[PDB]
Each structure stands twice: as structure tokens, then as C-alpha cells.
Design an enzyme around this catalytic site. Sequence first.
Site, mmCIF file in Angstrom:
data_model
loop_
_atom_site.group_PDB
_atom_site.id
_atom_site.type_symbol
_atom_site.label_atom_id
_atom_site.label_comp_id
_atom_site.label_asym_id
_atom_site.label_seq_id
_atom_site.Cartn_x
_atom_site.Cartn_y
_atom_site.Cartn_z
ATOM 1 N N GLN A 105 -0.537 9.155 -29.351
ATOM 2 C CA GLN A 105 0.257 7.969 -29.659
ATOM 3 C C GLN A 105 0.605 7.222 -28.369
ATOM 4 O O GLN A 105 0.624 5.998 -28.359
ATOM 5 C CB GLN A 105 1.494 8.301 -30.506
ATOM 6 C CG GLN A 105 2.224 7.068 -31.056
ATOM 7 C CD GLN A 105 3.499 7.428 -31.788
ATOM 8 O OE1 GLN A 105 4.202 8.372 -31.450
ATOM 9 N NE2 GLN A 105 3.816 6.678 -32.825
ATOM 10 N N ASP A 108 -2.533 5.361 -27.191
ATOM 11 C CA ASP A 108 -2.734 4.261 -28.121
ATOM 12 C C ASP A 108 -1.799 3.097 -27.773
ATOM 13 O O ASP A 108 -2.207 1.936 -27.709
ATOM 14 C CB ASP A 108 -2.617 4.790 -29.550
ATOM 15 C CG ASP A 108 -2.824 3.729 -30.610
ATOM 16 O OD1 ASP A 108 -2.027 2.732 -30.609
ATOM 17 O OD2 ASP A 108 -3.753 3.910 -31.457
ATOM 18 N N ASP A 110 -0.307 2.359 -25.002
ATOM 19 C CA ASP A 110 -0.735 1.747 -23.748
ATOM 20 C C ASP A 110 -1.866 0.738 -23.976
ATOM 21 O O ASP A 110 -1.919 -0.294 -23.306
ATOM 22 C CB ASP A 110 -1.166 2.805 -22.731
ATOM 23 C CG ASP A 110 -1.263 2.349 -21.278
ATOM 24 O OD1 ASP A 110 -1.905 1.322 -20.998
ATOM 25 O OD2 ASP A 110 -0.770 3.078 -20.428
ATOM 26 N N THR A 184 -1.860 -4.827 -22.439
ATOM 27 C CA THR A 184 -3.049 -4.863 -21.602
ATOM 28 C C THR A 184 -4.046 -3.790 -22.053
ATOM 29 O O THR A 184 -3.649 -2.670 -22.353
ATOM 30 C CB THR A 184 -2.683 -4.607 -20.129
ATOM 31 O OG1 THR A 184 -2.431 -3.206 -19.914
ATOM 32 C CG2 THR A 184 -1.560 -5.501 -19.639
ATOM 33 N N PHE A 186 -6.167 -2.219 -20.245
ATOM 34 C CA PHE A 186 -6.280 -1.166 -19.248
ATOM 35 C C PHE A 186 -5.310 -0.039 -19.564
ATOM 36 O O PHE A 186 -4.244 -0.269 -20.124
ATOM 37 C CB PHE A 186 -6.051 -1.728 -17.836
ATOM 38 C CG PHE A 186 -6.891 -2.957 -17.598
ATOM 39 C CD1 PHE A 186 -8.269 -2.851 -17.495
ATOM 40 C CD2 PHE A 186 -6.315 -4.216 -17.579
ATOM 41 C CE1 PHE A 186 -9.052 -3.983 -17.325
ATOM 42 C CE2 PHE A 186 -7.105 -5.345 -17.431
ATOM 43 C CZ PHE A 186 -8.475 -5.222 -17.307
ATOM 44 N N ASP A 188 -2.859 1.794 -17.963
ATOM 45 C CA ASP A 188 -2.198 1.246 -16.794
ATOM 46 C C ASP A 188 -0.692 1.454 -16.915
ATOM 47 O O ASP A 188 0.064 0.836 -16.167
ATOM 48 C CB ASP A 188 -2.570 -0.229 -16.613
ATOM 49 C CG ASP A 188 -2.060 -1.129 -17.739
ATOM 50 O OD1 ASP A 188 -1.544 -0.587 -18.727
ATOM 51 O OD2 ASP A 188 -2.192 -2.368 -17.632
ATOM 52 N N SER A 190 1.269 0.319 -19.127
ATOM 53 C CA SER A 190 1.957 -0.880 -19.627
ATOM 54 C C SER A 190 3.080 -0.551 -20.620
ATOM 55 O O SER A 190 3.992 -1.359 -20.805
ATOM 56 C CB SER A 190 1.011 -1.906 -20.229
ATOM 57 O OG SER A 190 0.174 -1.304 -21.212
ATOM 58 N N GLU A 258 10.207 4.376 -32.321
ATOM 59 C CA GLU A 258 9.694 4.540 -33.678
ATOM 60 C C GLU A 258 9.959 5.959 -34.177
ATOM 61 O O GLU A 258 10.199 6.164 -35.363
ATOM 62 C CB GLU A 258 8.215 4.119 -33.821
ATOM 63 C CG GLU A 258 7.579 4.356 -35.211
ATOM 64 C CD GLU A 258 6.832 5.675 -35.457
ATOM 65 O OE1 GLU A 258 6.462 6.313 -34.459
ATOM 66 O OE2 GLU A 258 6.588 6.086 -36.652
ATOM 67 N N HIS A 351 -2.724 9.829 -37.185
ATOM 68 C CA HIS A 351 -1.813 9.883 -38.328
ATOM 69 C C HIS A 351 -2.055 11.135 -39.165
ATOM 70 O O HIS A 351 -1.183 11.571 -39.904
ATOM 71 C CB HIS A 351 -1.866 8.597 -39.159
ATOM 72 C CG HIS A 351 -1.369 7.401 -38.424
ATOM 73 N ND1 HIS A 351 -1.634 6.113 -38.861
ATOM 74 C CD2 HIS A 351 -0.651 7.292 -37.273
ATOM 75 C CE1 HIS A 351 -1.056 5.249 -38.034
ATOM 76 N NE2 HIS A 351 -0.439 5.956 -37.046
HETATM 77 C C1 HEM Z 1 5.790 7.099 -37.068
HETATM 78 C C2 HEM Z 1 4.378 7.169 -36.448
HETATM 79 C C3 HEM Z 1 3.802 8.229 -35.785
HETATM 80 C C4 HEM Z 1 4.411 9.564 -35.533
HETATM 81 C C5 HEM Z 1 5.375 10.065 -36.345
HETATM 82 C C6 HEM Z 1 2.451 7.752 -35.349
HETATM 83 C C7 HEM Z 1 1.513 8.542 -34.689
HETATM 84 C C8 HEM Z 1 0.334 8.097 -34.112
HETATM 85 C C9 HEM Z 1 -0.573 8.860 -33.331
HETATM 86 C C10 HEM Z 1 -0.431 10.324 -33.030
HETATM 87 C C11 HEM Z 1 -1.617 8.038 -32.942
HETATM 88 C C12 HEM Z 1 -2.832 8.371 -32.106
HETATM 89 C C13 HEM Z 1 -3.343 9.614 -31.874
HETATM 90 C C14 HEM Z 1 -1.291 6.771 -33.486
HETATM 91 C C15 HEM Z 1 -2.048 5.641 -33.308
HETATM 92 C C16 HEM Z 1 -1.749 4.377 -33.877
HETATM 93 N N1 HEM Z 1 -0.764 4.079 -34.750
HETATM 94 FE FE1 HEM Z 1 0.566 5.279 -35.436
HETATM 95 N N2 HEM Z 1 2.286 6.498 -35.795
HETATM 96 C C17 HEM Z 1 3.411 6.112 -36.416
HETATM 97 C C18 HEM Z 1 3.659 4.872 -36.995
HETATM 98 C C19 HEM Z 1 2.795 3.798 -36.932
HETATM 99 C C20 HEM Z 1 3.060 2.494 -37.497
HETATM 100 C C21 HEM Z 1 4.292 2.073 -38.268
HETATM 101 C C22 HEM Z 1 1.983 1.697 -37.203
HETATM 102 C C23 HEM Z 1 1.755 0.237 -37.594
HETATM 103 C C24 HEM Z 1 0.872 0.165 -38.869
HETATM 104 C C25 HEM Z 1 0.456 -1.278 -39.234
HETATM 105 O O1 HEM Z 1 -0.733 -1.645 -39.355
HETATM 106 O O2 HEM Z 1 1.273 -2.199 -39.459
HETATM 107 C C26 HEM Z 1 1.088 2.497 -36.428
HETATM 108 C C27 HEM Z 1 -0.071 1.987 -35.901
HETATM 109 C C28 HEM Z 1 -0.872 2.730 -35.024
HETATM 110 C C29 HEM Z 1 -2.001 2.117 -34.254
HETATM 111 C C30 HEM Z 1 -2.448 0.678 -34.252
HETATM 112 C C31 HEM Z 1 -1.715 0.011 -33.071
HETATM 113 C C32 HEM Z 1 -0.358 0.633 -32.865
HETATM 114 O O3 HEM Z 1 0.715 0.082 -33.268
HETATM 115 O O4 HEM Z 1 -0.279 1.751 -32.303
HETATM 116 C C33 HEM Z 1 -2.544 3.165 -33.549
HETATM 117 C C34 HEM Z 1 -3.724 3.145 -32.592
HETATM 118 N N3 HEM Z 1 1.591 3.785 -36.282
HETATM 119 N N4 HEM Z 1 -0.123 6.834 -34.214
HETATM 120 CA CA LIG Z 2 -2.249 -1.032 -21.087
HETATM 121 K K LIG Z 3 2.002 2.975 -33.059
#
Ligand code: HEM
Ligand SMILES: [Ca+2]
Ligand SMILES: [K+]
Length: 595
Positions: A105, A108, A110, A184, A186, A188, A190, A258, A351
Site C-alpha cells: 500500500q 502504491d 507513492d 509523482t 517516480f 521518490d 512523495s 485511511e 486488497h
Molecule cells: C482500507 C484499504 C486498505 C487496507 C486496509 C488498502 C490496501 C491496499 C494494498 C495493500 C495495496 C497494494 C498492495 C493497495 C493498492 C491500492 N489501493 Fe487500496 N486499500 C484500502 C482502501 C482503498 C480505497 C478506498 C481505494 C480507492 C478505491 C477507488 O477506486 O475509489 C484504494 C485504491 C487503491 C489503489 C488505486 C490508487 C490508490 O488510491 O491507491 C491501489 C494501487 N484502496 N491497497
Molecule cells: Ca512518487
Molecule cells: K489506496
Amino acid sequence: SWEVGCGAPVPLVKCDENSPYRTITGDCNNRRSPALGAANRALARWLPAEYEDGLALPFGWTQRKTRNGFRVPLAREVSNKIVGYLDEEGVLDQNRSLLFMQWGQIVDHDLDFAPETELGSNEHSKTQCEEYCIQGDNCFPIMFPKNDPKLKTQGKCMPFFRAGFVCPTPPYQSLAREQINAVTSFLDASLVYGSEPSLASRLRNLSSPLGLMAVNQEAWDHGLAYLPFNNKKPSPCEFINTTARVPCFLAGDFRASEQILLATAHTLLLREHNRLARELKKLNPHWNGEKLYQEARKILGAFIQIITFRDYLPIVLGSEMQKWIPPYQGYNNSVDPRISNVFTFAFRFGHMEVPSTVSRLDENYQPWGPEAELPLHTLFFNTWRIIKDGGIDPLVRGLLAKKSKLMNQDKMVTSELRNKLFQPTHKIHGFDLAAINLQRCRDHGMPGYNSWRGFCGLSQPKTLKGLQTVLKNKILAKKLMDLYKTPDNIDIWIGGNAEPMVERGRVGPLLACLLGRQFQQIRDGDRFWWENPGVFTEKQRDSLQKVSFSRLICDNTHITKVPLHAFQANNYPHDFVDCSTVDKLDLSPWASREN
Ligand code: HEM
Ligand SMILES: [Ca+2]
Ligand SMILES: [K+]
Ligand SMILES: *[C@@H]1O[C@H](CO)[C@@H](O[C@@H]2O[C@H](CO)[C@@H](O)[C@H](O)[C@H]2NC(C)=O)[C@H](O)[C@H]1NC(C)=O
Ligand SMILES: *[C@@H]1O[C@H](CO)[C@@H](O)[C@H](O)[C@H]1NC(C)=O
Ligand SMILES: *[C@@H]1O[C@H](CO)[C@@H](O)[C@H](O)[C@H]1NC(C)=O
Ligand SMILES: *[C@@H]1O[C@H](CO)[C@@H](O)[C@H](O)[C@H]1NC(C)=O
Ligand SMILES: [Cl-]
Ligand SMILES: [Zn+2]
Ligand SMILES: [Zn+2]
């Protein structure tokens, strides 16, 4: 398309081409194309967007219109039929700690953020969406299927707002809607520092010339720092316990509060920055605050890169790591550094790695007090359990000694996320992340499963039997076919996550290809990659090679016992060692005099 709620503030900067530091926005990384990778531009499209009307309407918007001659199944309905499960027994990942999930997470956040359209505050639009479940403009509500229990308890839909997108520009000729990445591309840090200059300043400590990040002035963790509070109201973190009324933290990323363990990681990272700055001030008393901030920011950046590529990606990508990310060959200024639209769905594999509970452990890694283990949903937007219930250490200990959930074709997304997700604008622990992911795929014009299989040079199942063979699973394939009619229509998020995992990895073939390619680009296309010659000295690179997450913990908590390999499953005490035996980051290669 159709302008309502488009655009972002892309601030124009003249590039300091000779700076040894990344910019905050990510501009100027690529010299020939200074915007490549910068925040607040469109996500890259690996394949062209696929919309119901070819421009902007997601598949599933118009009840009459099909996809390839078939109706697309409701997002909540896919979730009910396929994603849910009752029994949490035996669901845990036997060789991945909870840190595995959490680090994902962090990486992601970043790399990518696609904020929902700001219809504005004060909205009757929010009202017509939530209260009346009326589809229109940015309101694309998730309607409950027949017999959904949420029908009896919640209403007709969950509200959902379409993602932000690039504004139509003065040709105004017709182009497909492109969603924005607000952070960003990168790797990095952010998420610590901000992707926007103004917030970046506000986060810093500018009262002292010491290059520190600002820290909370109202609360301390047995002497150790907490993030500042975000004072913007109303606060979801306040909402969840109005007696306790602890606000959300203010970080370089909007999403930091979150869930409690993300807030934890953000805290460890902020602590690290300040530690780095204090140490560099000791080594170099003449260095000013700018210099200290930039140098610590530069180190923390590389720290994130090393942990990700050395420790994380191998155990995600498994047998495919070598095929997608061979040994580095130096910076390639022709590689596209931008995060792709599809990647932001591919990385949501995590997820399926989130378990139903979180634990606080004591100094003997035993249950901390009488409510040690808490259901996950009670910890969305929860900062009071940190501030008012024992600090971060008990949570960090559980990160080390508890496990991630294993992805399971029969047990995909825990009910805590699938039925009880809390959203920051709304008031109920009542949302479905799986349904949201599927809706969002459609929102973003995602090509379908077989489109991506082809992109990755994999076979494209057309029949029930073909899909059963891809999935190695008869019942899952059949349920998928009943819902989608054609594997061509399977939304990429469910499609990619349905595949059995590659050897030694935690994702299947399709996802290994999508993630692998993106991570390859993130490294090769970054002029400030830590291994790019001239970014660090050789001696500095030798120092950096010794960094570990275990050390980060030792340096930034009062935990004195840690595993050497923090990402695998570790049991106390056999797998834990005293902090004194763990390699430190040697900062002497940063010492700087004039003689
Ligand atoms: C609460 C949420 C988490 C933990 C209890 C959780 C966990 C992860 C992990 C472990 C990821 C990568 C290995 C990961 C990636 C991305 N998530 Fe997700 N996440 C929780 C809650 C959310 C919510 C709310 C969103 C938004 C959904 C929407 O489309 O409106 C969400 C998205 C993402 C996402 C897309 C970009 C971002 O916001 O991170 C991942 C790459 N997560 N999460
Ligand atoms: Ca970044
Ligand atoms: K997220
Ligand atoms: C910004 O930096 C200053 C100077 O380091 C911080 O001030 C000190 O804070 C610690 C902890 O509160 C105290 O023990 C010191 O006595 C303070 N010294 C000075 C110079 O006042 C200040 O708290 C930091 N500001 C923020 C908002 O993080
Ligand atoms: C857990 O995974 C790591 C992968 O690097 C491996 O070295 C370790 O031996 C594994 N333990 C198992 C598979 O039990
Ligand atoms: C709110 O926090 C208080 C302490 O601040 C605690 O005793 C109580 O259980 C909490 N209530 C909720 C709604 O979680
Ligand atoms: C760098 O990038 C382009 C596109 O990826 C590729 O054709 C080229 O072979 C690469 N060149 C080097 C020197 O690696
Ligand atoms: Cl894409
Ligand atoms: Zn302590
Ligand atoms: Zn609401």
C-alpha cells in the site's frame, strides 16, 4: 470528457537542469520531456481507453447498450457472487507478514493517486447521488442487485463519483477521457513530502534551519514524534469517535489516515526523515536547512527504492522477477516513466492480502491489554487508537508478528473491506471496496481481460473450458461466465486476481506481466534512480546497500527485538534478534568539508 469537474493545478516551473535534487512535482526528471512522470498529468494509456460511447461513458452506464453484445453484470453483483466468503479460518498467508501487505500500500501510494471528481463542497450533487441514487455527470452509483442484504439496510445503491480527468484543451476535438495521476510517478517518497510545492512547504519545519519535517505539538509517543494533525473540518477521523475527537494526520499523501497501519508506516517514515536530518547536522554543522531537508529526503527516497526492489518485488513477482526486471543497465531517457492507467488496477491485488483483524502486541509480542485484536473496519480513519491507546509500537509489533491474508480463489476479499468499508465523505461503515474497484475499472475506460492477456502475450480464453484451464478452477470459471457471458468482458481487476499465483510469487501471470513492466519502467526511466551513477557516490551506495525495514523499526521505535527478514512470516522469539545485531546505515560517506 464534457468538462464538468475536470483538470488539476499543473504549476509551471523553469527547470534547474543542474540540481542534484528531485523536484517536488516530479518535473525536470526527463530533460527532453520535463513533464514526463510529473504529478497532475494524465495516466499513461498502454492500450486506448474503452468507453461505451467511445469518449467518456463507462461500460454499464446505459442499460440498453451492451459490451460485445452482452450486458455487463452489476459491480456489487460480481462482488456478492465471487469476491465474498464467510470463514476467515485458514485464510492467512503462511510465509508473508502483515508488513508485506502494508509495504505494498505504501509503494502504491507513492506511485499513483486518481482523486474523485470534486463536484465541490456544499453539494446537492452529493445529495442526489447518495440519497436518490441518480446517475448523471460525475455520479455513477453502485446499484445493489436483487436480494442484496444492503437493500434492506442501506438503500438502493452506494454513491460513487467518477475519477478526475484532463480538461478538454483548445482544439477541443474529440478524444477519450484520460484520468489524472495526482502524485509523482517516480518512487521518490512523495507520500511523505507531497507532490505539490505548497503542501511540501507546509509539511516542513521552517522555524528552525535544521531541515526537519513538522511534528505534532499536542501529542508524543513516549518522546517520539507523531505526524501533525490535519485541521480541515469536518474530519472523518473525528467522526468515528466524537468523544475522543482525534483528527486525521497531515502527510505528503491525502490517504495517510485511511487505516491505522498505513498511518503507522507514515509515522515510521516521518521519524526516519528527522533522524536522518539530525545525524547529517551532526556530520555537517555548516549545512543549512534546505541542504539538510534535501539530503535526508534524497536518502529516504533511495531507502524506499531499495526496500521495494530488493525485498518486496521478488516475493510478489516470484519466478517472473528476472524476466521483467533483469539487472539494472543504467538510466534510459527514452523509457516512459509515467504510471499507466491499468497499473493502478493491477496493484490493487493487495486488497486480497488484507486480513479481518489488527492486533496490538506488548514487549513480549503478547496480546496488549484486553482489546488486543480489533476488527479491521473499526480502524478505518482511526487515529485515536494511536494517540489515545498506546502509540505505534504495539501496532508495529503486530506488523512483524502477524500475517497478511493469502489470496484465495474461494476467499478473495474479507468482509471488513467488502461490506464495511468507511469512506471519508460518508458516514457509514457500509461500502464495498471490491464493487468500487470494478466500478472504477469501468470509470477509467479499462480494456477487458482478454485485451490485457493479449497485451502480455498470453492465451485468450474464449469458452468456459478455456477459462477453466487458465484459472485451474471449474467453479470460479463457471460463475465468471454466468456473470460476464464472455471472458472478453471480465473487468481487469477481477480477471487478473482470479489467476493462480506464479511460482514463488503472490500474483498470477497476467498481473506479473503488468506489474513487472511498470516497475521496470519506474527504475529505468528515473534519472534519480539510486543506482544511476552520479546520483550517489560509490561509497554512499555501499552504505545504502545495508538498509533494512528492521533497522528503520529499531531506529524509530522503542522495539528492541526484530526479525532479520521482516517481510516473511516471523514468530517471536525464535525468529527475532536484538537490534544491536542489525546493520545500521553508515552516514560517514555524506560528511562534507571544504578541505
Ligand atoms: C482500507 C484499504 C486498505 C487496507 C486496509 C488498502 C490496501 C491496499 C494494498 C495493500 C495495496 C497494494 C498492495 C493497495 C493498492 C491500492 N489501493 Fe487500496 N486499500 C484500502 C482502501 C482503498 C480505497 C478506498 C481505494 C480507492 C478505491 C477507488 O477506486 O475509489 C484504494 C485504491 C487503491 C489503489 C488505486 C490508487 C490508490 O488510491 O491507491 C491501489 C494501487 N484502496 N491497497
Ligand atoms: Ca512518487
Ligand atoms: K489506496
Ligand atoms: C521545529 O524545530 C524546532 C527546533 O528543533 C523544534 O523545537 C524544539 O522542540 C523540542 C520538542 O518540542 C523541544 O524539546 C525544544 O526545546 C525546542 N527547541 C526550540 C529551538 O524551541 C520545534 O518543535 C519544531 N517545530 C515543529 C512544529 O515541528
Ligand atoms: C519465505 O520466503 C522467502 C522468499 O525470499 C524464502 O527465502 C523463505 O525461505 C520462505 N519461507 C518459506 C517458503 O517457508
Ligand atoms: C472513544 O474513545 C474513548 C477514549 O477516548 C473510549 O473509552 C471509547 O471506547 C471510544 N468510543 C468509540 C466509539 O470507539
Ligand atoms: C532504451 O529505450 C528504448 C525504448 O524502451 C529502447 O528501444 C532502447 O533499446 C533502450 N536503449 C538502451 C540503450 O537500453
Ligand atoms: Cl492503460
Ligand atoms: Zn517507550
Ligand atoms: Zn454520506
